[PDB]
Symmetry: D2
Subunit: 343 residues, 4 copies
C-alpha cells in the first residue's frame, strides 16, 4: 500500500531547504567542477591546476561581498570544495551559510556509456550514496546535484537512455531525501547538433515526463526537490535563429507540460550559452506570459563564472576585480530570476 518514504518532519525539512534554495530573487552558483573539469577552465588562462589555486578560486566565488547574498540561494560544491577553508580559516560551507546561502554538493560520479546506444551515457554514483549523503548532511550540505547527460541525435535520445537517466535520477533523489538532502534533478539535454527549437522542446518534454514518472515511481517528495533542466534552445549547429522570447516560450511550455507544480523551483543551467545570453534567456523565461507555478531560478556554472575567471587571470591582484564581476553577474541573474533584468 502506502509506505511513507519520508515522515512529515522530513518532508517539512526538505520543503524548507528547497524553498530556501529557490527563494524569490535567489538562484544557485554551480561551483561543482571536478579537478579535471576545472582544469580546462584554468587552462583557458594559463594558470596551473593545484589544490591552492582551486581553493582560492572557490574562495573568490564564495567570499564575494554582501550584495551577492540575496542573489545566491544555493552553492553547489565539489567534494574537495566542501572541505576547504577560506583565508580567515572559515570552512567554505560555513562561508556559504554565513551569507544566507544553502550549501550543495555534487554527488554524481560522472557519466558512463550505455551499450547498444548511439553514444548515449548514463550517470553513476549510487554506490554508498546514502552514507555519502549523510556525511554531506553532517558537513553542511543541504542539497545535492546529479547531472544526467542526454543528447539529441538522429536516433537519440533512445527509450533506453531516457528510462535509464530517469531511473538513476529517481534513485539519487530517493537516497538524498532519505538522508535529508534536497535532490536537484538535472536531466540535462546537450545542445549539440543541428536540432531546432521544436525538436529540443519535444525531447525536453519526453525526458521530463519520463523523469517525473520515475520520481513518482520511486516515491520522491517533489516539494523537497528542485529541477535543473536544460533551457529549451536550438542546437549549436542549428542555422535557424530563434529570439529570446521564442526560447522562453518553448522552455516554459515544455516545463508546464511535464513538471508538476509540487516541484519547489526550476533552476536552469547555462548549457554552453554566454553569460549575457543566459541571463537574458532567464529574464525572458520569467517574463513569459504563461503562468509559471514554480520559482524559475538559475543554477549556472559558466554563466556566473566565465567573466569572473577571465578577470581573475590566475593572479591575486585581480581578486577584487573578479569579485566585482561575479557579483554583477549574480545581480543580473537574480534580476532575471525576478523577471526585471534590463541590460
Amino acid at each position: 500500500h502506502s509506505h511513507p518514504a519520508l515522515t512529515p518532519e522530513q518532508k517539512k525539512e526538505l520543503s524548507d531547504i528547497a524553498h530556501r534554495i529557490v527563494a524569490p530573487g535567489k538562484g544557485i552558483l554551480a561551483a561543482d567542477e571536478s579537478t579535471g573539469s576545472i582544469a580546462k577552465r584554468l587552462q583557458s588562462i594559463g594558470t596551473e591546476n593545484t589544490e591552492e589555486n582551486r581553493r582560492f578560486y572557490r574562495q573568490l566565488l564564495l567570499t564575494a561581498d554582501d550584495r551577492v547574498n540575496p542573489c545566491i540561494g544555493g552553492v553547489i560544491l565539489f567534494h574537495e570544495t566542501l572541505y576547504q577553508k577560506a583565508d580567515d580559516g572559515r570552512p567554505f560551507p560555513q562561508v556559504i551559510k554565513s551569507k544566507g546561502g544553502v550549501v550543495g554538493i555534487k554527488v554524481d560520479k560522472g557519466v558512463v556509456p550505455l551499450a547498444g546506444t548511439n553514444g548515449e551515457t548514463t550517470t553513476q554514483g549510487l554506490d554508498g550514496l546514502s552514507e555519502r549523503c549523510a556525511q554531506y548532511k553532517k558537513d553542511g550540505a543541504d542539497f545535492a546535484k546529479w547531472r544526467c547527460v542526454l543528447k539529441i541525435g538522429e536516433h537519440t535520445p533512445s527509450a533506453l537512455a531516457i528510462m535509464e537517466n530517469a531511473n538513476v535520477l529517481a534513485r539519487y533523489a530517493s537516497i538524498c531525501q532519505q538522508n535529508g538532502i534536497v535532490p536537484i534533478v538535472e536531466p540535462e539535454i546537450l545542445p549539440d547538433g543541428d536540432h531546432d527549437l521544436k525538436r529540443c522542446q519535444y525531447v525536453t518534454e519526453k525526458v521530463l515526463a519520463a523523469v517525473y514518472k520515475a520520481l513518482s515511481d520511486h516515491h520522491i517528495y517533489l516539494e523537497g526537490t528542485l529541477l535543473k533542466p536544460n533551457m529549451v534552445t536550438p542546437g549549436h549547429a542549428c542555422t535557424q535563429k530563434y529570439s529570446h522570447e521564442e526560447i522562453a516560450m518553448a522552455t516554459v511550455t515544455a516545463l508546464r507540460r511535464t513538471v508538476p507544480p509540487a516541484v519547489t523551483g526550476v533552476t536552469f543551467l547555462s548549457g554552453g550559452q554566454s553569460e549575457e545570453e543566459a541571463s537574458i534567456n532567464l529574464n525572458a523565461i520569467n517574463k513569459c506570459p504563461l503562468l509559471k507555478p514554480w520559482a524559475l531560478t538559475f543554477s549556472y556554472g559558466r554563466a556566473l563564472q566565465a567573466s569572473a575567471l577571465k578577470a581573475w587571470g590566475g593572479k591575486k591582484e585581480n581578486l577584487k576585480a573578479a569579485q566585482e564581476e561575479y557579483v554583477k553577474r549574480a545581480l543580473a541573474n537574480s534580476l532575471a530570476c525576478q523577471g526585471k533584468y534590463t541590460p
Copy 2:
C-alpha cells in the same frame, strides 16, 4: 523524431474549447447517463424509463434559465441526448450552445473486467472512436468524456490496472484530439472500502502520474485536455473523520504532485458524495492555500441533479421547481469553483 500529432490550428482550437469549458465561474453538468444508468435514478422516484421521460429530464437539465449560463461551461451528454430536441424543437446541443455552454459527449463504452485482477476493470470504447468523434464534432459536441474506473483494495489498484487505464485514457485523448474534440480524462478512483485519506491521496497520485505519463507517451496536447479526477476523500467505510479542509488539502496536494500545469482545468466529479458536501469540498479545494495553476471546476453528475430529480418527481407540474433547484445548485457549485461558496 518529433512528428506533430496536432497542427498549431488544431492545438489552438483545442485550447480554446478547453478554456471555454473551464472558464472562471463555469463548470460541467455531467448529464451523461446510459439507459440503464439513468434507469436506477428514475426508479428512485417511481417513474418509468422511456425515451420521452429521458428527453424531458434532460430538457429540464438543459433548458434552465439565464442564471445557469455563467455557471455551466460544459454539458456532457449521452449518445441519445445529443440527438434529442427541446419542446420548441431546438436540438439539445443547440440549446447548450445558446446558453454559452460547450456540448460534450460520453464516448466510452463502459468498463470490462481485467483478467487476473481483484475485480479491477478497464474501459472500452476505442473501436471506431475516430469516426464517432468526428460525427460528434459535426453534431456540436466539442469535448468528450471517458470514465476509467479504479478502486482501492488490499492489492488494488494493481500495476496492470493502472497502466491499462492510463493507456486507454491516452488513446481516447489521442483520438479525440485528432478529431478536434477536447478529451476529458477521468481516472476515477472509487471511494469504496475503508481506505483513509492518506491512502486515497497516495493511490490518486500514482494513478494520475501513470495517466499523465501515458498522455505524454501518446503525444497528448495537455492544453487541449481537461482532468476529471476523484476528489481525494476517505473511503465510505472509513471510520476516521476528515474535515473539508483536510480533504481539500489532500486533493490539491495530489493534483500538484502529478498534474502538469499545461492542463487547462481540473473538473472534479461527485463520486458518491451529497450535493452540499460536494459543493463544500469544491469550495474548500478552491480555497486551499496551495498555489493552484489550473481551473478547479466541477463536473458533477449527481451533485447537480439529485435534488432536481427529487423535486421533479417525474411529473410535469414540478418542472419549474426542479429547474429552480438545479439552477440554485449550479450557482452554488459555480461559487465553489470561484472559491466563494458560503452556505
Copy 3:
C-alpha cells in the same frame, strides 16, 4: 497477489486447443480476409466480389481432399466465413472440424493511425470482444487472430507504437483466454523499406520482448497462446541479398531471444513473400541447428492461396485444379514445418 485469470480447466482447454493447432506436421490456413481485403485478390483475376464468390472460394480452400487434413491444424476465418455453408449444406466451421482442423476467427477490427507517429498504426477491435469471442466459441471458433501492424522506418517503430501494439495484443489475448479461445498474437512487422536482415532482427526482438512483457503484465497463459510473427527478412527495398539459411538463422535467433518456451508454437506469416520462398524459408527455419522449443508451423494467407486463386480463375471449371494446387502447397508447407521440404 496472485489472482488466477484462468482456472486449471480453462488452462488445460487452452493448452489442448493450442497444441492441436500446431501439432507436428500441421499449420494454419489464414483464410481470413475482409470484403475489401479479398476484393483486391479477386480483382487480380477479374472476378467480381460477391457473397457467393467469396463463399465458393472459401469452400474451395476448406473442402480440399483428405490428404490436406494432417497438414492444416487450423483455419482462420473472417466473420462472414464462420457463418457460411458448403455446397452440401455443412457449415464451414463444421467442415473444418470434420477434417481435423481447428476453427479460427479474425477478431481484430483493423488498424487505426497513432497520432504523433510516422505513419504508425495500432489495431482496434477490443470493444465487446468478450461477447464476440464467446459467440465465436459457441459457433465453433477455438482460436482467434489479431493482426498488429508494425513497420520499420528511420524513426519507426517508436516506443509508443511498440508499447501500444503489445498492450492491445495482451488485452486481446486476455479476452480470448477468458472466453476459452486461444489467442494467436501477431506483432507483424512490415517488410517495407530498405532495412537489412540485421535491423529486421533487432526490431523483431524489441517488438517480441515488449509483446511478451505485455502478455506477462496481462496475466496471459502463454501455453494457451500462439505467436504469429513476421519472418525475420530484409526489406523489399533492401539491395543486399540474404540466403534462406541466413534468414532462418536470424528468425530463430530473434525468437529464441524473446519468446518464452511456454508458447505452444510459432506460426509464421507469409508477409509478402512468394509461395515457394515462404515454404523454403519455413523449411530452413525448421532445419536451423539452434534448439527450437516451439512448434514452428505456418499461418500463411497468400503463401497457401496464391496459386490456388490463380488456378481457380473465378470459374467453377477449375475447382479441382485449384483444390489440387492448394493441397500441394499445403503439403509443401507441412513438410517445411516438419523440416523435410525438399523442392
Copy 4:
C-alpha cells in the same frame, strides 16, 4: 536504430564462456562470501574470522581432487578470494582454471533500502563497474554474479522494487558484457513468509518477465548470460507441504513462461534449503517432463559447503574429510544437474 552493443567476436566469447560454465554435468560453486557474510558461517563452528582462515577454507573448496573437475563448471569468488593463493603458491583463479572450471567474481556491492517500500531493497555496485570488470577479466574472472534480493509480502514485491532490480541487473549485465564477462543474473526471491508454491511461482514469473524485459531494453546478449533464480518453493512459514515433483514442476513452469531459450543456462541457488533437499529438487527439476531448452545447473553457496564446513571444524586435521564431503556433494549436484541423482 540497431547499434551493436557487442561485436560478433565479443558475442562469441561470451557464448563460449557461458556454455563452458553450464556445460552438461557442470555447475557453479558459489564461494563468494564477504568478510561479514562468511563470519556467520565460521562462527557456527567456533573458528575466528581471519584472512588466513578464509584463505584456507577457500583453498579447501577450490583445491578438491579430480572428481570435482567434471562437476564444477564455475566458481564465484569474493574480491579478496580472487587475489589469494593456494598452499603451493598457485593463485585461486589459476587453481580453478587448472581444474577446468571458470573463474567468477561477485561484483555487486550489497543491497540498499528502497524508500517508500515495505522493507524492499535494491542492489548497488554499478559505480566504476566497467573498470572493476575489466580488472577482473585481466585477473582471470570470466563471469560475474549480481545478487538482487526480492521478498514476498502482503504488498511485496512492489512494481518499484521489481522494476528497480530488473533495471540494475540489466545495467550490471550490460557492463559485464561490455567488459567481456558473462553476467549471471540473480533476481533472487527470498523464501521468507507463509506464501505457498503458487504465489512463489506467480512472483517468480513476474520478476523474471520484468528482468528479461529490462535485459532486452539494455540490449543484453542473452546467449552470453546465465540466470540464477530462486527455486520456486513455498515459504519457510508455509504450512502446506509440497513434494519435490510439485516444486520442480512449478520452477520449470515459471522458467518456461519467462526465460527465453537464448539464455545459455539456468543455475539455481540454494536459497536456504538443506544440501540434500537442494540436490533432490535440482534432480527433480532436471527430471521434469516439460521441455527445458536451457542447462539447468546449480549455483549453490550453502548446498555445496554446509557439510564441508561442518566436517572441516576449522582445524587442519579434517582437511581431507571436508574436501571429500564437498567432493561428494558436488558429485551429487552434478548428477542432479544431469537428472540422474538417485540418493
